[PDB]
Design a protein around this nucleic acid. Structure first.
Lengths: 83, 221, 141, 185
RNA sequence: CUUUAAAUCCUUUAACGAGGAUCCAUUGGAGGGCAAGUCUGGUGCCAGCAGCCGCGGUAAUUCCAGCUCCAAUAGCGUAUAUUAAAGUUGCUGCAGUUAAAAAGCUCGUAGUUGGAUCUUGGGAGCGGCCG
């Protein structure tokens, strides 16, 4: 959070949901930080860096999490266009 | 007298590898081991007991009464907590309530009123909390007005570090435990509110599991 | 509200008047029969004369005989049952004496454990009962 | 038809809760620290601070670049500077709300006489105000409820009709000397 | 001395005027609300206390008296109208299945409320598309 001195007086910044554009609470223990590896650009290996996502609890309560992961991997560059 | 951790969280915070509990709040890690707060929060933490309510069963051979303890915990510049424990012995009730109040600790953030000068002192927006029929409202106030409420959210907001509030209670307020839980739920929804401040799409840092799995693969089995 | 249009006001005034008339305390405060049935008639205190001193029983959970003074008013002339407040102060009030009768505090209603008696006595023979209790003055013979 | 004023106001106010621990203990701590006679004085100072805070809030609820708001804010800032409670480093309308009751009670004449080294105790300072011993700018003050302004702080000294700062000795010294001279002669 | 049509009101000033200041600070309370004793004697459902719950039946943290105690303290307590508390009159801002509360149903004159659409865009120029 801003100030007239140009300093961040807020103690920490919570993360954001990648499927609902919401704020993850500290007591919300249903939030998922999925890690997805990428394949090597040459033949088949793992390059080393990590590609991660996030999701909130209420989506997983309702159920539409698999579609969210599918569109995130499709627009990110993992799933092919035809699918 | 020496704490031995059970889960990996206690081992990671005991082996001086986890810096603070701020990233524990950031990654929403489930806290279930009691003295993580004792390792992280120092001597600024204090405690006070709200009310003791006796509840009775009914049996063919008389009635059995057990204590129900309500407690409010938190350092005066930082976080809060709450704990409800029921036991036959009053000392075990207070001890279990203290342990549960150290367990359920939430982070809070503070805003300004109009002018963005100095340190924050009040709630950023109009938040609320409900349980049963109790409806507790929080309205931001100008600096130096002081918190205007009943005595128990007064002491809760003085251990919350927030100096200025306006309240509006509804329903049966005479149940002190439900009223305390309602204002705790009101103060717990401070971070669950989207603002134009937090419109930035945040970046992802390394998870404590992802960076300490090389340690916990050989620390304990 | 329910009538919530831009050009409706008189319906809201009539409904507010009717629903305020359906209240109980405002009906007690704005009708002449409640002030007429009250023996004081809007007076905080009223003087009267003593014709008989008869005690009355208590309620169920306690058993005592708290003695009361029946006082006929002067401004109206009706038989009103008062109640002596303190202990050992009944003997100060005798027959055909001048007393000052005031209520007890519950807006003109029965109070505590005394049935049908609503008012109390503050002065007798132009001297207060507290002075006779504390020994600050004497009864004028 | 008479030529009378009938302009009176209540300076002290009473809180709603009569018996609570924190307010009574804090008011008693202020009374013991600053030598107040009763809680009416600290209630009066709290009411004046509340009126100043209400004026500040009624000025912050107006927008900028307005002549009335700027004039009232500037005049309030000059008054709060001239009563000596604030410093010239932070002279803005938003700092009016960040004032304490000890800031107002520090500018009292009793605490000023106690802090200038001309009095030993706080109660002794209150007595010395009430005993008509000192003066400011050749004018004696017998009242402890005085707000000392900033430009008149170095003009505080004992009165010329006082035996402490130079004057006629009091009644006790002449009585003791007369008794000793009568006993000797 | 001054003031006033002369005094009495205030200010000023000679002379007296305190050491247990006796030159006496009182008023309600002490179970809870509500700050304040498991102190001591008396009657022990009688006398009484208590705005409400309640306290009195032979060991009363409440009755009647002594000390201590707590609140404002030259002030404190009681009665009676009134306001905030009352989101229990709800326009802001109530409730209508079960706590009080949707007419047996429908038509219908007053009253309240009522679908979309009719003029966009530009340049000179203060400048690194636009205030």
């Amino acid at each position: 959070m801003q100030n007239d001195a140009g300093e961040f007086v807020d103690l920490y910044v919570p993360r954001k949901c990648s499927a609902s554009n919401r704020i993850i609470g500290a007591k919300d223990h249903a939030s998922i930080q999925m890690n997805v590896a990428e394949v090597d650009k040459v033949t088949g290996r793992f390059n080393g860096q990590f590609k991660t996502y996030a999701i909130c609890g209420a989506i997983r309560r309702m159920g539409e999490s698999d579609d969210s992961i599918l569109r995130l991997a499709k627009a990110d560059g993992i799933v092919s266009k035809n699918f | 007298k020496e704490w031995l951790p059970v889960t990996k969280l206690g081992r990671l915070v005991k082996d001086m590898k986890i810096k603070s509990l701020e990233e524990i709040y950031l990654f929403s890690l489930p806290i279930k081991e009691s003295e993580i707060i004792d390792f992280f929060l120092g001597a600024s933490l204090k405690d006070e007991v709200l009310k003791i309510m006796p509840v009775q069963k009914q049996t063919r051979a008389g009635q059995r009464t057990r204590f129900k303890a309500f407690v409010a915990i938190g350092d005066y510049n930082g976080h809060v907590g709450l704990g409800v424990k029921c036991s036959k012995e009053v000392a075990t009730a207070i001890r279990g309530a203290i342990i549960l109040a150290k367990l359920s600790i939430v982070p809070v953030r503070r805003g300004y009123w109009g002018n963005k000068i100095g340190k924050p002192h009040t709630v950023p927006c109009k938040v609320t909390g409900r349980c049963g029929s109790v409806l507790v409202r929080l309205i931001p106030a100008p600096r130096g007005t002081g918190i205007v409420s009943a005595p128990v959210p007064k002491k809760l907001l003085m251990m919350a570090g927030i100096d200025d509030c306006y309240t509006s209670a509804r329903g049966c307020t005479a149940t002190l435990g439900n009223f305390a839980k309602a204002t705790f739920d009101a103060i717990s929804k401070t971070y669950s509110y989207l603002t134009p401040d937090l419109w930035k799409e945040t970046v992802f840092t390394k998870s404590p599991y992802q960076e300490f799995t090389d340690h916990l693969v050989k620390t304990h089995t | 509200g329910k009538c919530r249009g831009l050009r409706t006001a008189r319906k809201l005034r009539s409904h507010r008047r009717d629903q305020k008339w359906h209240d109980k305390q405002y009906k007690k405060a704005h009708l002449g029969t409640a002030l007429k049935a009250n023996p004081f008639g809007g007076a905080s205190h009223a003087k009267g004369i003593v014709l008989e001193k008869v005690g009355v029983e208590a309620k169920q959970p306690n058993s005592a005989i708290r003695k009361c003074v029946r006082v006929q008013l002067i401004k109206n002339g009706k038989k009103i049952t008062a109640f002596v407040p303190n202990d050992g102060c009944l003997n100060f009030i005798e027959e055909n004496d001048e007393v000052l009768v005031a209520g007890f505090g519950r807006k003109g209603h029965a109070v505590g454990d005394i049935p049908g008696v609503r008012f109390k006595v503050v002065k007798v023979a132009n001297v207060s009962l507290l002075a006779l209790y504390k020994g600050k003055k004497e009864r004028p013979r | 038809p008479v030529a009378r004023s009938w302009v009176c106001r209540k300076t002290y106010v009473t809180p709603r809760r009569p018996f609570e621990k924190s307010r009574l203990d804090q008011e008693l701590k202020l009374i013991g620290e600053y030598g107040l006679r009763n809680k009416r004085e600290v209630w009066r100072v709290k009411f004046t601070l509340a009126k100043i805070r209400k004026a500040a809030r009624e000025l912050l609820t107006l927008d900028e670049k307005d002549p009335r708001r700027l004039f009232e804010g500037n005049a309030l800032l000059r008054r709060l500077v001239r009563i000596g409670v604030l410093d010239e480093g932070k002279m803005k309308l938003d700092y009016i709300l960040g004032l304490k009751i000890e800031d107002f009670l520090e500018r009292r004449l009793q605490t000023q006489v106690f802090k200038l080294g001309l009095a030993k105790s706080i109660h002794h300072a209150r007595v010395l105000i009430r005993q008509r011993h000192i003066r400011v700018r050749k004018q004696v003050v017998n009242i402890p409820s005085f707000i000392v302004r900033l430009d008149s702080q170095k003009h505080i000294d004992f009165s010329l009709r006082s035996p402490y700062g130079g004057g006629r000795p009091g009644r006790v010294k002449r009585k003791n000397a007369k008794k000793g001279q009568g006993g000797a002669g």
